[PDB]
Design a binder for this molecule. Sequence first.
Ligand code: HEA
Ligand code: HEA
Ligand SMILES: CCCCC/C=C/C/C=C/C/C=C\C/C=C\CCCC(=O)O[C@H](COC(=O)CCCCCCCCCCCCCCCCC)COP(=O)(O)OCCN
Ligand SMILES: CCCCCC/C=C\CCCCCCCCCC(=O)O[C@H](COC(=O)CCCCCCCCCCCCCCC)COP(=O)(O)OC[C@@H](O)CO
Ligand SMILES: CCCCCCCCCCO[C@@H]1O[C@H](CO)[C@@H](O[C@H]2O[C@H](CO)[C@@H](O)[C@H](O)[C@H]2O)[C@H](O)[C@H]1O
Ligand code: CUA
Ligand SMILES: [O-][O-]
Ligand SMILES: [Cu+2]
Ligand SMILES: [Mg+2]
Ligand code: NA
Ligand code: NA
Ligand SMILES: [Zn+2]
Lengths: 144, 73, 46, 84, 49, 227, 105, 79, 514, 58, 43, 94, 259
Amino acid sequence: SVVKSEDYALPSYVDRRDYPLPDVAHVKNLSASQKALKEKEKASWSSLSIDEKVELYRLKFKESFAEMNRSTNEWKTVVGAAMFFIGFTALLLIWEKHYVYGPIPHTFEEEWVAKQTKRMLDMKVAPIQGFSAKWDYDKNEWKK
Amino acid sequence: STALAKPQMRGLLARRLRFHIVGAFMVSLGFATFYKFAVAEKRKKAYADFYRNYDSMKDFEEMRKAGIFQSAK
Amino acid sequence: HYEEGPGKNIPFSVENKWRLLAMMTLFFGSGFAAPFFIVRHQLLKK
Amino acid sequence: ASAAKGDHGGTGARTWRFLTFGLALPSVALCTLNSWLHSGHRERPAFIPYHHLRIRTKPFSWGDGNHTFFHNPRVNPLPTGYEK
Amino acid sequence: APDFHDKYGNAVLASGATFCVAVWVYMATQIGIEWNPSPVGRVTPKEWR
Amino acid sequence: MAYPMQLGFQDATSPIMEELLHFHDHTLMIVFLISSLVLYIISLMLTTKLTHTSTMDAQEVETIWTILPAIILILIALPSLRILYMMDEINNPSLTVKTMGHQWYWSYEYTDYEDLSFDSYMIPTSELKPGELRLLEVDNRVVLPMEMTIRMLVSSEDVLHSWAVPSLGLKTDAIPGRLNQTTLMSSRPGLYYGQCSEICGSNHSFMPIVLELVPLKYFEKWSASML
Amino acid sequence: HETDEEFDARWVTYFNKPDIDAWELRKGMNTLVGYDLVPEPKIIDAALRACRRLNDFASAVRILEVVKDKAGPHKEIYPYVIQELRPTLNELGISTPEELGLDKV
Amino acid sequence: KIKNYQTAPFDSRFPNQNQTRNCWQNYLDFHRCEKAMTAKGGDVSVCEWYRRVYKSLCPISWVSTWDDRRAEGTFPGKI
Amino acid sequence: MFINRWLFSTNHKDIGTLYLLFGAWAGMVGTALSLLIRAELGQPGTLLGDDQIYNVVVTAHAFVMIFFMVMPIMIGGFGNWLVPLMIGAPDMAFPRMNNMSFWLLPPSFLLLLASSMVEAGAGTGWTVYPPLAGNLAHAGASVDLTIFSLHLAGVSSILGAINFITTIINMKPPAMSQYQTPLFVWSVMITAVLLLLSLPVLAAGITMLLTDRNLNTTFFDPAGGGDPILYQHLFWFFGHPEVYILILPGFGMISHIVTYYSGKKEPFGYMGMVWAMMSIGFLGFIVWAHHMFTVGMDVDTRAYFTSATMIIAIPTGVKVFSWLATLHGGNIKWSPAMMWALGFIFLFTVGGLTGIVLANSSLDIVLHDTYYVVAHFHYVLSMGAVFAIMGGFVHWFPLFSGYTLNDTWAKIHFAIMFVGVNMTFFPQHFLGLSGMPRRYSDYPDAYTMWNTISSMGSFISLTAVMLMVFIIWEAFASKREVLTVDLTTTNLEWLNGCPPPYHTFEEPTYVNLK
Amino acid sequence: FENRVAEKQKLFQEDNGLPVHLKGGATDNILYRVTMTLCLGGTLYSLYCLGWASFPHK
Amino acid sequence: ITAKPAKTPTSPKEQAIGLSVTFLSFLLPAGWVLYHLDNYKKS
Amino acid sequence: ASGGGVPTDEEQATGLEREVMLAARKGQDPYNILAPKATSGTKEDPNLVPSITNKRIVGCICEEDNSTVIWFWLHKGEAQRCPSCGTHYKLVPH
Amino acid sequence: HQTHAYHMVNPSPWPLTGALSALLMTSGLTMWFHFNSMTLLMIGLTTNMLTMYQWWRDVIRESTFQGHHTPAVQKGLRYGMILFIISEVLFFTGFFWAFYHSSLAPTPELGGCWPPTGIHPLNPLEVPLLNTSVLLASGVSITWAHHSLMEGDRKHMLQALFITITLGVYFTLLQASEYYEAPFTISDGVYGSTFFVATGFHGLHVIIGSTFLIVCFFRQLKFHFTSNHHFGFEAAAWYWHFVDVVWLFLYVSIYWWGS
Ligand code: HEA
Ligand code: HEA
Ligand SMILES: CCCCC/C=C/C/C=C/C/C=C\C/C=C\CCCC(=O)O[C@H](COC(=O)CCCCCCCCCCCCCCCCC)COP(=O)(O)OCCN
Ligand SMILES: CCCCCC/C=C\CCCCCCCCCC(=O)O[C@H](COC(=O)CCCCCCCCCCCCCCC)COP(=O)(O)OC[C@@H](O)CO
Ligand SMILES: CCCCCCCCCCO[C@@H]1O[C@H](CO)[C@@H](O[C@H]2O[C@H](CO)[C@@H](O)[C@H](O)[C@H]2O)[C@H](O)[C@H]1O
Ligand code: CUA
Ligand SMILES: [O-][O-]
Ligand SMILES: [Cu+2]
Ligand SMILES: [Mg+2]
Ligand code: NA
Ligand code: NA
Ligand SMILES: [Zn+2]
């Protein structure tokens, strides 16, 4: 039951599916009834009740395989919290845009971009695949 | 009732591995076949087609008439 | 000779979690702040 | 090579002393005499203000900033030539 | 005995998701960020010379 | 030039850049194959409750792990070095142009026949004409004849710079006291842009390169007019 | 290398040692579950009878749990092993984890 | 003899990206040639090829600096 | 008592802890600098000033992350803590010299801070190439302070390397051969050999820069017959081994973490792992000029450096596949440390592969001095070295402190960082291929989208860093004391409890020879 | 000269709990105090020098 | 790993305080500097 | 040629160096310089592990050339077995 | 009480004072180079000397006087010294690399030749040859010293060590005189740069090595060394041979081949 820090060098209990029979029993100290049960265990196990069998298991082991292997809802907390902090990050970015960043250059104004786009087409920027290739020079429109 | 038949009990991990490593390989061949076709061959064809009947002087005249050049009006 | 065990093998105290918070705040916060104040310093020169 | 000497019966103190006084120090004495004969001043090289020499990209941290650390007026011209 | 995840996991997931999507959509579309997307199929070219 | 949301290389303007695109395609296919295989095997290792924790013999499997990567490396190196040696071949240039890097602008010298030289500075953002590209335009472009082998010689008169034109596959460091050579051959007329590619101080970001590729006869008249 | 039959026989002999001690029982089971196999019923039978000689009912139940665990997603293996062990379980009065409610999370 | 000069031809002595020595060698060759032609009272025009080549290859500032140093008597190359 | 213990230490654990604290502080400095870079680039235009202030920030970012965060954490911190424990040694060979390796670092860091405060800072790049770093283009004290900072960091690591090599060779149990030492111990020994050989060449090179700047030497000045390119050779002769120095202790920790959380007693193919690290260490010395493919080297030299660089993929692949084979059949524990290690294996592979792309001198013409290089190295550094550091920190924090972290918090931290680093760096491949140069404070408009996304990624990473600090606070605030640790039979460093006593192995382990 | 190593061995092995750098006696303490004072004072001076050099002097 | 329950449990409220203080220690000084960039750049 | 005047270790070695020297002359290893030779390691013939306290860490190299060492505390009392190979070790304090 | 053979060192202030001395010397050099002041540098050099003196003093106390140098500790120090020497070899390698880079491909600024136009190298058959005979001789005399010590011969050890030191001093004074007499300087381009920096660092190492030998001489005088235990002397002899070998490489490369 109670494990002490200063016991680090002594054989210890573990529940691990790959180490089914740990180095020590889960419970070593036995009450009067638990002593009687361990004596009863020396006789036929058919004479042990279901309750006595479970009690013997629980003296030897802490958790069963089903218990130690159980799934949890932890993923929900992890994913939810991560999304929260990622969300919080966007607040920082909103703050930065409002208080730190000034105007971007005038070259991003709609009319500038329209003219710059035509000039890029006039000089046939990336005419093989990248840019002008996607413009229809015969129909004077973007290719479908 | 009837008895349950004896199942395979040995080498379950190794059998799973053998089966899936093939699937890791058979994918790669399927992707390569696709990637070569979707990106690489498409690029080779794009360049081949562009230049096949490409007229550099006509290209220049269009650029010149659009007014892009310092050296040519 | 020296204190042994959890919370004793370190050059900072963990006896009080709030005093610890203040110290960690000053420690990590000073590290993070320094480049911003060096930038401020360089900008204020010329 | 086997040097040209001999011994090798036992490399001990006596042998290494024998080498110290019988080979090593006589060699030093000989080279010292040789140096003492080729000693005396070599002529001062005529000054040419070659741009790959007498480099000054920053003043030296001593003197007038224009003199090298072991400046020898006789053989080390300044960027402007030999000292007056 | 239900642990933290049993009690609050659903809510942390739902709220975290909703908050994250809402704030990122807002930041991306409502505060004047210039993404500079491709002009292809979007911009009508205009005479420049 | 690059365009918005671009994923890959600028379109090739020279045959060597075309070669580089196809070699990148080849290599990236291999990169995608190996990355995906590793990711898949990772996922496979992690998705079973079945266990085997005793000592596993290693020498059989390590053969595959060494030989297959060795083969893949050879399949990368073969076309890699073919291109390397192609770039180094003798080609016989019709023209030699020099460029000198400066803080913060490029000068150009065309001195095969006449003493033609000029400086090339970024157009300030406030002085861009409508449709011109921020940080990319220059006052005086590097006018060159198209469809001709040109020897470009690159140096610097101060700190390191590097002369780059991505769409021609070009990047040659500009080093004081050194004359570095590259070859330039454009398949097409047009305007081809690049930027200083060595950190060189306060306006490193702001000393671009603009090539203007035109027919020989136009290059000749421009040359004469620039004397 | 040795056959499957020879492997199984070694393990049966291991657990069948009349004076096998507690340490050797644990060593045996902890080593066995490291392998890429669910142990044959005959191996498990021998280990369960070792538990009996060591007056250790709990370890017998735990051994049944390990069998189920080593099968992973192969749900057909454990019920077959239990089927094969039923005469031994009846003889020795060993209740399965399921009969004890120990399969509950 | 071989005019219609376009640019400096490939030179097998200097086949690599570093062309510093090519410029240098041709600069040296020209001035060595013109000195040898003046000493014997001959025609400097036989040296023209070296001049064309170094003019094509050499940065203006290098040539200018080297010319200045020849005039100053500080040119470190042997002519 | 405080001064005796913390300023006069001769104890490997306490010195380890000093290094971890120093490295953590440096990490905060490096993170601030990274955020300043991405703030400048987060929208088109100028935020801070021109390229001088910008590249002072970039330069300092690199030096702090490399010399003050990664090396002190991996080698000084984990090396000092773990190496003596893993070989059952009572301390390091030279416990007093060990303390000077530590105390040289705050003065080194102070000199770096000074460099940025005086004049206009050293806006040179972490490579410090002349003539930009020379006394004309960088007049004044900044670059000299940088040189001196590197000198002190260099001496610190050279003496540390002597200490680790001596300790690892000389202080094992007499029955333990070198082929019975854990992989982390191997990784530190090989790293130490790399430091011993490479740092003195850096020291020679930066000293020559110092004399060019102050004693009128002309090693790198063509006016005196010098050559800027000579500096590059000397720097990179150190600089390539340096990146293997940054990753090797990472490889070592990954081997331990993957083994541990797979429930294995041992890594797959131990001698192959040893072979692979030695091969990588050796090959790391014969490849430096892959940093110089555009300087104008002869073609055959370029062919050799292409080929010798690529060959390193072979031993590295052996390690990657051996980690996968270690996972194989594991009882997988999805601990936060395991998550870091799994992220490492994949993301390091990606960065290693883009390294192989760059090894090709022909393609490197177009990729050199672009963001493609920046993408490559942050995959192996921010998603490699750092992932190994975070994995090791989470794994061994209970050993060092005797307290547990909150696993759920640590998983949340991993998730945030993973998203942040990938959002930061993945788009930089696109920027590189499309031609965005390195060391730019501003970019042509076309590059806006990926720079915007990259900068948003950097802010996510910031949130992860801030959370990490809180997580460490929470552990010390709550004081959950460690009880039992699994697999001590194959993880000796745990066997003396958490934390281990000040003096461990006063009585050495018993190991017989048979 | 005479071999006085035995005397020094006795001195430096005295069971007095002193660390080796102070075990020679009062002169160790003096030299230590001189060393630490110069180091700490010098370090303070270096920081003053940094402060001075951090600002222009036109 | 196994461990004892916390010797000095840190409640959700206490964690919210630690988290907030930690975040503010990073954000406020940097925020102050960045907010005032225009003020520095006009000197 | 050749006088004396140089002390020997016998004359002048002190402290721990001297202890190691004198013990080595007696064929003793109190400071664990040598690797102990294994017994058959059965329960009748266990490896005898000296200690100055009531527990000591054992490392077991189970088979020759194993790279993996198996580590455990050996306590005073009944012999304990390596958890990997079962070889027996028994503590012999002081 | 430990039952291993290794040395747990008393907590010590010398690592901190050494580290601070490094700060003071480097910030001091900066002050000297830029702010026309030698004060910080002088304090740094002083604290460095104090640190080295007290640190190595303590190592002597720990070994000769306290007996902490068991065979295992001594073996560690052997490795330590070897590794240190290796690091020093690599440091010099950087300077040899610089020399060969510049000399094998002389730039146009030099006149495209080595030695450069206007450089008048020293005659390698004159004082440089003398210097060579001197250091080679000192390698012979130090080996005599080692064998005398092993054979228990106090007087001949002292005489041989004195001779070795005298030769180190002779080399140093000869080099100092050659520096003064040289018609070229450190500012005479890359020839002066490589010559003075490479031979200068070597000269510094000769001074360090001579100092180490002198330390050994006084320890010997004080009977510290046994006929079997004398690692300080061994380390100084190894360092001395290193200094000799570096000279031989310098002589062949810079003085002879580079002339
Ligand atoms: C920890 C840091 C680190 C690491 C480990 C590496 C590892 C590698 N690096 Fe990198 N690199 C840097 C940090 C690092 N790098 C930095 C900081 C720079 C820029 C310096 C500067 O200019 O500031 C840089 C620059 C750099 C360049 C220069 C590009 C340029 O400037 O133009 C090159 C080119 O060769 C290169 C290549 C490689 C290669 C081949 C590896 C290899 O070691 C990678 C090997 C790994 C793998 C290949 C993956 C695993 C293998 C398999 C799954 C097997 C199967 C694979 C194949 C068959 C290919 N790197
Ligand atoms: C280890 C090395 C390292 C690391 C981790 C990083 C991390 C980051 N880097 Fe950096 N970078 C370099 C080394 C590194 N960098 C180098 C060498 C250069 C080239 C310099 C030059 O060009 O001269 C460079 C250049 C560089 C550039 C290019 C500048 C330019 O060319 O103009 C950019 C731009 O986005 C960038 C951004 C970032 C970002 C956003 C991060 C973020 O991922 C950082 C986020 C935070 C962390 C990763 C946490 C760090 C702290 C800890 C881990 C402490 C914890 C302590 C314990 C566990 C004890 N970096
Ligand atoms: C017998 C030779 C012994 C050498 C003793 C001389 C004193 C200098 C100190 C020695 C250290 C050596 C290397 C430093 C480099 C420069 C000195 C080279 C040796 C020398 O002394 O060169 C002299 C110039 O010294 C000068 O500039 C003055 C230089 C003085 C300032 C030193 C600069 C400090 C540099 C710091 C070095 C950093 C160390 C890093 C350690 C690596 C860490 C890993 C030559 O004199 P000259 O008049 O030019 O020519 C002769 C003309 N008649
Ligand atoms: C101009 C001045 C500025 C430059 C600063 C350098 C100054 C010069 C200093 C010269 C070095 C003096 C070193 C003295 C060391 C004495 C301590 C010693 O030698 O300690 C010995 C151990 O060796 C040990 O630590 C081995 C100790 C190894 C020391 C290594 C010395 C080299 C350090 C060089 C400094 C690096 C500078 C390089 C420049 C790039 C003690 O053991 P034993 O000898 O076996 O004795 C025990 C027996 O008596 C028992 O019977
Ligand atoms: C790269 C990492 C940085 C990420 C971004 C940080 C997120 C923001 C944190 C908050 O920072 C604060 O912001 C306030 C503005 O919201 C500033 O008040 C400023 O503005 C107020 C009014 O707008 C005035 O009351 C104050 O006087 C004035 O300082 C204040 O100084 C600053 O500390
Ligand atoms: Cu010019 Cu960067
Ligand atoms: O360096 O990669
Ligand atoms: Cu590299
Ligand atoms: Mg570059
Ligand atoms: Na910007
Ligand atoms: Na000896
Ligand atoms: Zn064993």
